[PDB]
Motif scaffolding. Structure first.
Motif, short mmCIF file in Angstrom:
data_model
loop_
_atom_site.label_atom_id
_atom_site.label_comp_id
_atom_site.label_asym_id
_atom_site.label_seq_id
_atom_site.Cartn_x
_atom_site.Cartn_y
_atom_site.Cartn_z
N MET A 31 0.66 -1.24 0.05
CA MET A 31 -0.02 0.02 0.10
C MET A 31 0.80 1.30 -0.10
O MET A 31 1.93 1.30 0.61
N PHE A 32 0.25 2.39 -0.58
CA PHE A 32 0.89 3.75 -0.47
C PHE A 32 -0.52 4.71 -0.32
O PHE A 32 -1.29 4.59 -1.12
N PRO A 33 -0.69 5.45 0.66
CA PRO A 33 0.24 5.52 1.98
C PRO A 33 0.14 3.98 2.63
O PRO A 33 -0.62 3.29 2.30
N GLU A 161 -6.41 9.80 -13.07
CA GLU A 161 -5.15 10.21 -13.11
C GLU A 161 -4.46 11.31 -11.82
O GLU A 161 -3.30 11.44 -11.70
N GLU A 162 -5.42 11.91 -11.31
CA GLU A 162 -5.01 12.61 -10.02
C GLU A 162 -4.19 11.54 -8.86
O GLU A 162 -3.33 12.08 -8.08
N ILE A 163 -4.84 10.40 -8.87
CA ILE A 163 -4.37 9.53 -7.94
C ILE A 163 -3.00 9.10 -8.34
O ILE A 163 -1.94 9.03 -7.69
N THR A 164 -2.80 8.72 -9.50
CA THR A 164 -1.62 8.26 -10.31
C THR A 164 -0.69 9.43 -9.99
O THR A 164 0.42 8.98 -9.28
N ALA A 165 -1.06 10.61 -10.22
CA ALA A 165 0.08 11.65 -9.60
C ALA A 165 0.35 11.91 -8.30
O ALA A 165 1.63 12.12 -7.84
N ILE A 168 2.88 9.39 -7.17
CA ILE A 168 3.98 9.79 -7.36
C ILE A 168 4.81 10.90 -6.56
O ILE A 168 6.18 10.80 -6.22
N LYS A 169 3.74 11.86 -6.43
CA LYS A 169 4.29 12.98 -5.63
C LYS A 169 4.66 12.65 -4.25
O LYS A 169 5.97 13.08 -3.67
#
Ligand code: NA
Length: 171
Positions: A31-33, A161-165, A168-169
């Motif tokens: 998992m992340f977080p 795509e906001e979750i994908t980003a 990564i952030k």
């Protein structure tokens, strides 16, 4: 009194505001977080095991349509009951309370292929739940806490795509 607090709650809330997603794979994905909690109010002298499971949130599945999660159909039959034992288990109250308890190694999967993985249904929403089990107790006392900030939809691939980003952030 026993208190189990979510660590990094502001970080989890950034994901929850988008609707959080966790990847499930055949061989399992961390998992992340990461779910991490702080604990006070255990007996420092007693021994406990920490367990993690995932509670199904809904009587339906979800789908991502025109950039929004919406009800997506009747649900699959419930995933088999899978419990993850925190690897520090069993351990003293003092161990669990001296520093945050991290579930960094738990893997989420969509295939029963071993390795203490947690099976979840894709496009179903889940809420992490931690259990504290007292060792050597004839009454088998267990405590359960749920973490609403940490709800997510299991996915085979990120939809938003906001979750994908965000993944990564912050990772
Ligand atoms: Na299995």
């Amino acid at each position: 009194e026993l208190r189990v607090g979510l660590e990094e709650s502001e970080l989890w809330l950034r994901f929850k505001e988008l609707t959080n997603e966790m990847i499930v794979t055949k061989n399992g994905r961390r998992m992340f977080p990461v779910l991490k909690v702080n604990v006070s109010g255990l007996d420092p002298n007693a021994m406990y095991s920490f367990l993690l499971d995932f509670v199904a949130a809904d009587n339906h599945r979800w789908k991502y349509v025109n950039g929004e999660w919406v009800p997506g159909g009747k649900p699959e039959p419930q995933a088999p009951s899978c419990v993850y034992i925190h690897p520090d288990s069993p351990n003293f109250g003092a161990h669990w309370m001296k520093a945050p308890v991290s579930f960094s190694k738990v893997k989420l999967t969509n295939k029963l292929n071993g390795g203490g993985q947690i099976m979840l249904n894709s496009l179903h929403k889940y809420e992490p739940r931690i259990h504290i089990v007292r060792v050597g107790d004839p009454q088998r006392m267990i405590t359960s806490h749920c973490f609403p900030e940490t709800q997510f939809i299991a996915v085979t691939a990120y939809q938003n795509e906001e979750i994908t980003a965000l993944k990564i952030k912050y990772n």
